[PDB]
Structures are given as C-alpha cells and as structure tokens.
Structure 1
Amino acid sequence: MSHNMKGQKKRLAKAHKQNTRVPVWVIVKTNRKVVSHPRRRHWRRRSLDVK
C-alpha cells in the first residue's frame, strides 16, 4: 500500500487504460493492418517508468 498523490494515481490509471488491445472494429476498418500496439505490457515485467 504505497501512497500515491493525485497525479501519480492519475498517471497509473492512464497506464492501466492504455494497457488494452486494439478494437476489433479498428482491425476491421484497417483490414487487419493495424493489429499491434506499442503500449501493451504485463504488470509483472519491467515496471512502468511513470510513477
């Protein structure tokens, strides 16, 4: 239970909601040409350089 401030928690929330797959409708729109994403990650890896 490390204690974050408002901005630190906001940046963690941004990282969390960035950690999402590309939408299937986006894949359909791009015709399976944008399927990947540079901000995908896992929580148990090299940590965020955000906090």
Structure 2
Amino acid sequence: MSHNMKGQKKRLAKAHKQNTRVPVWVIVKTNRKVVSHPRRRHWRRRSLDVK
C-alpha cells in the first residue's frame, strides 16, 4: 500500500491541504479579482510528483 516514510507523508499532507476553494471573504475583499489559484487538481488526473 505504498509504505511511506515521514517526509513523503509530510509532503502528501501539504499537497492535500493545497486543494482548497479560495475563501469567500477574499473574493468579497478583492472585488471578484481573485477567484482561483494554480494549485487546484483532482485525484484521478495528472499524478502529482510530490514523492
């Protein structure tokens, strides 16, 4: 099941945390000028090269 070390799991946790919708108050404050970031992906697509 892909036995991982500590560092690999750490990087996987970070790449997980980056999949987030931009906060609503950011969109309110910037006046609909920020609506996305380049860190969004999906698990069944291009594999991440984190490991």
For the aligned pair, the TM-score class normalised by the smaller chain equals: over 0.9
Secondary structure at the aligned position of 2:17 is classed as helix
TM-score calculated relative to the size of structure 1: 0.94
Query: How large is the RMSD of aligned CA atoms in angstroms?
Result: 0.6
| Cα distance in structure 2, aligned partners of 1:23 and 1:30 | 11
Unaligned runs of 5+ in 2: none
Percent identity over the alignment is 100
Structure 2 residue 50 is matched with structure 1 residue 46: no
Structure 1 residue 10 displacement after superposition: 0.5
TM-score calculated relative to the size of structure 2: 0.94
Unaligned runs of 5+ in 1: none
| Cα distance in structure 2, aligned partners of 1:45 and 1:27 | 27
